Amino acid sequence: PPLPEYGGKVRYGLIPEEFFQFLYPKTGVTGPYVLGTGLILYALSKEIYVISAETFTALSVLGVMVYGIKKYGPFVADFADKLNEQKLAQLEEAKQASIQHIQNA
Amino acid sequence: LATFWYYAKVELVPPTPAEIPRAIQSLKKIVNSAQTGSFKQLTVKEAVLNGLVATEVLMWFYVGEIIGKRGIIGYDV
Amino acid sequence: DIDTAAKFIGAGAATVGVAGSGAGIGTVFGSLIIGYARNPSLKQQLFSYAILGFALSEAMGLFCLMVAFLILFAM
Amino acid sequence: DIDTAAKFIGAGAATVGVAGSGAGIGTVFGSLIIGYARNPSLKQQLFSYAILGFALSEAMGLFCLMVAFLILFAM
Amino acid sequence: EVKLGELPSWILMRDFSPSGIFGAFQRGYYRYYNKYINVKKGSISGITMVLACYVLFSYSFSYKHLKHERLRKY
Amino acid sequence: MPQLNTTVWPTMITPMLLTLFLITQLKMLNTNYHLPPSPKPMKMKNYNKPW
Amino acid sequence: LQSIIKNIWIPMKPYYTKVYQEIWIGMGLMGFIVYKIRAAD
Amino acid sequence: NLFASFIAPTILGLPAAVLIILFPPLLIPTSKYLINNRLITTQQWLIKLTSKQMMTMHNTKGRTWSLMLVSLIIFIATTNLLGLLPHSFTPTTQLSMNLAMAIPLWAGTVIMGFRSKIKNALAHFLPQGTPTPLIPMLVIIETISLLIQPMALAVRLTANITAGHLLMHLIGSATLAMSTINLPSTLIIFTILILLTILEIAVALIQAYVFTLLVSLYLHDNT
Amino acid sequence: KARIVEYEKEMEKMKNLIPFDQMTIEDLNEAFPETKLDKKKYPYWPHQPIENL
């Protein structure tokens, strides 16, 4: 069976567009944003997310990962795509050759 | 960048004096819905969505008290 | 007491022994630089022997380090 | 007491002596990298001499380590 | 399914077997897989989202060690 | 060191035994690299005729 | 009792039976070591 | 208060180390197709490459362990690379798991060299080109050497993750401590932390590959 | 002549191959039986010489 041509329309690599479209009718476009900022401020205000060393090691690893993606991402993307295209073309030039074989026989 | 303030000034304003009549009338509406028992006739979707908007405005209360204390994490004292 | 004191001293002494692994890793990768600039077509075999030597150097270094952590936090 | 304290100190000091084996193994495998990049057709004899040198280096390192464990846990 | 039922009857109709819970988990796995990963020309998110939920789980069980470090006292 | 609380060791060993000797190996055994298609256009030995 | 032997044991038989024999001897050694360790505490 | 990240985890009184250890395989999906998604494309390329690297140097009796060695390196590398996420319990930092990954494989390959290979195996206990006058205790070295092989293996990992992790942790502390004193000093400590994190990624991958390669060498020497 | 139309049957088969982005490894093996991994000379994964791997 074939495979769909795309994934799931995620935003900021963390949130799928389904959530934005799901909150838009009853909060508008800034609704998800205001909900997120309010939840953030309540989380780090009532000390349910303790700011500690882990906060800064997390900021480090997240900066590293976002830069790693935004730099070496398209390269890996088109590399996987080229792997696929090479395999496909090799198989097709492997079909043609056997057709030619049988016709020559 | 600039559409941030566009959205702020276009949706999230304090109610204009001409609106809190509409606000009081719609609060009359919803607590009338409470007095009748119409809330029980509400299904999953807008129930959880009203819960979400309540969470949002409660976050707004917490933001209000943090701007009260002029500090964010706990009390500066 | 005297025991915690000597445990601190012994942990410092034990951890001194990483210096050898530091220098051994330095030598391994310096040699690797040289061997690469000498025949830059055995890169994979050179690098394999590199990882192997580094692994043994780190084996000794971590022996020293765990001894520090054994006499310090365990014994 | 004073005896357990000095045993900890002596164990740390004794374990310092692994640094030499760490550096010696580093040198052995760095040389091996070089000698391979120099004549990559004696791989088996080079690697045999490699294991031999590493074995003697580890002989000294484990001498030091057992002395640590002898003065620490046995004496 | 849920998101169309609104009665407790449903929870009394759904199985609660060992085989049942395993089947539910497996169906969930395959739904997420076929939705976000198993599509050609896919994107990275299908991985980072699992990573983020992993971080959330590992945080919430690493919380009892963090409440003993809260910056304030109230 | 918590690494030495030797009353929590089994619960660290056994799921590793599973995930390393059973689950990862099954995840690999389903990864197979087919040999490349070698369509030899030259396979014809019929014969001449009896003459 | 089914599938546990159809997707779990028939692909691993060539390894669990013939290739990983000394691996199991080593696992016995490791189990004895761990028993002796946790016992001496 | 400091080794908390290595304390055996639990949630709601349940042993959540199980869900942690069994998770890495869930990150390697598999398929019967021929032209599949980007994820499995890249993962199969990586496994193909790793197999070519590890197993080329073996005869067939060694190459029988191809599945074992590649699964080993994949499991260890995913575990380590999952360790770098914040507030995450890295099960390789435990001495238990590493001893259980080390003693089985090494003991297995030594006994495999002992079942077959028996004259060969008892002879490699001695470098033959050695002169006579101290052939004897030379093999004492070797024998001792041999029995230190497994422990080393386990140790060789348990630290270079554990230490590494602690290491980053402390600079976190450090920068947090300087978060309120001198902003540029905070910035440069943060930069040290960034470079450190990069080094930690690299050393996770390297330690996985190294554990694998050393088990591989013991194999090749005992087949 | 028997061989003629045998060959032409085979050519119609190879001409009626499902596109490759739908084919499973089993079907590719059935349609190119040279790609069948020799599970006799190589009984253990990856079921081929590591050089070709």
UniProtKB/Swiss-Prot annotation, chain A:
The modification N6-succinyllysine is found at K87. It is found in: Mitochondrion; Mitochondrion inner membrane. Transmembrane segments: none annotated. The modification N6-acetyllysine is found at K95. Coiled coil: none annotated. It comes from the Eukaryota. Subunit b, of the mitochondrial membrane ATP synthase complex (F(1)F(0) ATP synthase or Complex V) that produces ATP from ADP in the presence of a proton gradient across the membrane which is generated by electron transport complexes of the respiratory chain. ATP synthase complex consist of a soluble F(1) head domain - the catalytic core - and a membrane F(1) domain - the membrane proton channel. These two domains are linked by a central stalk rotating inside the F(1) region and a stationary peripheral stalk. Component of the ATP synthase complex composed at least of ATP5F1A/subunit alpha, ATP5F1B/subunit beta, ATP5MC1/subunit c (homooctomer), MT-ATP6/subunit a, MT-ATP8/subunit 8, ATP5ME/subunit e, ATP5MF/subunit f, ATP5MG/subunit g, ATP5MK/subunit k, ATP5MJ/subunit j, ATP5F1C/subunit gamma, ATP5F1D/subunit delta, ATP5F1E/subunit epsilon, ATP5PF/subunit F6, ATP5PB/subunit b, ATP5PD/subunit d, ATP5PO/subunit OSCP. Belongs to the eukaryotic ATPase B chain family. This is ATP synthase peripheral stalk subunit b, mitochondrial. It comes from Homo sapiens (Human). The lineage of its organism: Eukaryota, Metazoa, Chordata, Craniata, Vertebrata. The chain holds residues 45 to 149 of 256 of the full protein.
UniProtKB/Swiss-Prot annotation, chains C, D:
It is a multi-pass membrane protein. The keyword Transcription does not apply. GO terms for biological process: proton motive force-driven ATP synthesis; proton transmembrane transport. The chain crosses the membrane at residues 16-36, 51-71. Its main location: mitochondrion. Trimethylated by ATPSCKMT at Lys-43. Methylation is required for proper incorporation of the C subunit into the ATP synthase complex and mitochondrial respiration. It catalyses: H(+)(in) = H(+)(out). The keyword Cytoplasm does not apply. There are three genes which encode the mitochondrial ATP synthase proteolipid and they specify precursors with different import sequences but identical mature proteins. Is the major protein stored in the storage bodies of animals or humans affected with ceroid lipofuscinosis (Batten disease). Belongs to the ATPase C chain family. Homooctamer; the c-ring consists of eight c subunits forming a circle, and each subunit adopts a hairpin shape. Component of the ATP synthase complex composed at least of ATP5F1A/subunit alpha, ATP5F1B/subunit beta, ATP5MC1/subunit c (homooctomer), MT-ATP6/subunit a, MT-ATP8/subunit 8, ATP5ME/subunit e, ATP5MF/subunit f, ATP5MG/subunit g, ATP5MK/subunit k, ATP5MJ/subunit j, ATP5F1C/subunit gamma, ATP5F1D/subunit delta, ATP5F1E/subunit epsilon, ATP5PF/subunit F6, ATP5PB/subunit b, ATP5PD/subunit d, ATP5PO/subunit OSCP. This is ATP synthase F(0) complex subunit C1, mitochondrial. The chain holds residues 62 to 136 of 136 of the full protein.
Curated annotation (Swiss-Prot), chain G:
Keywords: Membrane, Mitochondrion, Transmembrane, Transmembrane helix. Subunit j, of the mitochondrial membrane ATP synthase complex (F(1)F(0) ATP synthase or Complex V) that produces ATP from ADP in the presence of a proton gradient across the membrane which is generated by electron transport complexes of the respiratory chain. ATP synthase complex consist of a soluble F(1) head domain - the catalytic core - and a membrane F(1) domain - the membrane proton channel. These two domains are linked by a central stalk rotating inside the F(1) region and a stationary peripheral stalk. GO terms for cellular component: fibrillar center; mitochondrial inner membrane; mitochondrion; proton-transporting ATP synthase complex. Belongs to the small mitochondrial proteolipid family. This is ATP synthase F(0) complex subunit j, mitochondrial. Component of the ATP synthase complex composed at least of ATP5F1A/subunit alpha, ATP5F1B/subunit beta, ATP5MC1/subunit c (homooctomer), MT-ATP6/subunit a, MT-ATP8/subunit 8, ATP5ME/subunit e, ATP5MF/subunit f, ATP5MG/subunit g, ATP5MK/subunit k, ATP5MJ/subunit j, ATP5F1C/subunit gamma, ATP5F1D/subunit delta, ATP5F1E/subunit epsilon, ATP5PF/subunit F6, ATP5PB/subunit b, ATP5PD/subunit d, ATP5PO/subunit OSCP. It is a single-pass membrane protein. The chain crosses the membrane at residues 21-38. The keyword Transmembrane applies. Signal peptide: none annotated. Its main location: mitochondrion.
From Swiss-Prot, chain H:
It is found in: Mitochondrion inner membrane. Its main location: mitochondrion. One of its GO terms (cellular component) is proton-transporting ATP synthase complex. Changing L214P: In LS and MIBSN. Keywords: ATP synthesis, Cardiomyopathy, CF(0), Disease variant, Hydrogen ion transport, Ion transport, Leber hereditary optic neuropathy, Leigh syndrome, Membrane, Mitochondrion, Mitochondrion inner membrane, Neuropathy, Primary mitochondrial disease, Retinitis pigmentosa, Transmembrane, Transmembrane helix, Transport. It catalyses: H(+)(in) = H(+)(out). GO terms for molecular function: proton channel activity. One of its GO terms (biological process) is proton motive force-driven ATP synthesis. It comes from the Eukaryota. Changing L153R: In NARP and LS. The chain crosses the membrane at residues 3-23, 65-85, 94-114, 135-155, 161-181, 186-206. PROSITE patterns: ATPASE_A (PS00449). It is a multi-pass membrane protein. Belongs to the ATPase A chain family. Component of the ATP synthase complex composed at least of ATP5F1A/subunit alpha, ATP5F1B/subunit beta, ATP5MC1/subunit c (homooctomer), MT-ATP6/subunit a, MT-ATP8/subunit 8, ATP5ME/subunit e, ATP5MF/subunit f, ATP5MG/subunit g, ATP5MK/subunit k, ATP5MJ/subunit j, ATP5F1C/subunit gamma, ATP5F1D/subunit delta, ATP5F1E/subunit epsilon, ATP5PF/subunit F6, ATP5PB/subunit b, ATP5PD/subunit d, ATP5PO/subunit OSCP. NCBIfam families: ATP_synt_6_or_A. This is ATP synthase F(0) complex subunit a.
